[PDB]
Every structure is written in C-alpha cells, then in structure tokens.
C-alpha cells in the first residue's frame, strides 16, 4: 500500500559511468 | 535514407522557416524517426504555427 523506493526508470538512453 | 534535395531546388514553398535546426545542415545529420503532419490553413494562419 506504499511505494517504498519503487518506480525508478531510466530518464534517457545515454549510458553513464560511475 | 533521406536526401533533402527535392525541397531546396524548387521554390514552390511559401514559408520555409525551420525551427531548432537549419535547413542547409539536414543533409548530413541523421535522425531516429521523423514525424510529418498534414493540414490546410486559411492562408493567414501560417504565422500562428
């Protein structure tokens, strides 16, 4: 009943390192 | 594979006003997917677009 750190998608298609 | 050659030689276009990108540089740059539109305005409605 609570979205505990859920729904995190990639904002774009660019690959990013550390 | 686009060429953008049939749009610059002819002069039957009323208002060739590009936004964001330039027309003279579309022959080298590629795109992922282009979207075309089709609608008829009442002459003086081109400036509103």
């Amino acid at each position: 009943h609570t979205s505990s750190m859920r729904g995190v998608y990639y904002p774009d298609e660019i690959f990013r390192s550390d | 594979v686009a060429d953008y050659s049939v749009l610059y030689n002819s002069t039957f276009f009323s208002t060739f006003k590009c936004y964001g990108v330039s027309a003279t540089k579309l022959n080298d740059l590629c795109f992922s997917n282009v979207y075309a539109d089709s609608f008829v305005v009442k002459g003086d409605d081109v400036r509103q677009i």
């Binding site: - | 964001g20 990108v21 540089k25 740059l29």
Partner: protein, 49 residues
C-alpha cells in the same frame, strides 16, 4: 568548474559540436558567443578563487 563547463548559457545546447552541426555559421556564432562569454566568466571566477 566542470559543471559550469556543461552549462547552457542561453543557447541551443550546452555541448559543443552540436550547434555547429544543426545550425548555420552566421546563425551559430550568436549562440557560440554566449557560451564563450559564460565559460570565460566561469573560468575567471575559478582563477580568482
């Protein structure tokens, strides 16, 4: 300094070699001047600090 390098100082994009590919030189110099001024100001502030 790195974050100020990738800053869009009132131009089309904050990354070089991207406005010279989609725009014309007479229309691209206007956007290049703003980025140059912003980067010069940021680098001068960094040098002062």
């Amino acid at each position: 300094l790195v974050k100020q390098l990738s800053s869009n100082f009132g131009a089309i994009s904050s990354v070089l070699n991207d406005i010279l590919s989609r725009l014309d030189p007479p229309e691209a110099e206007v956007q290049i001047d703003r980025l140059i001024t912003g980067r010069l100001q940021s680098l001068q502030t960094y040098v002062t600090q």
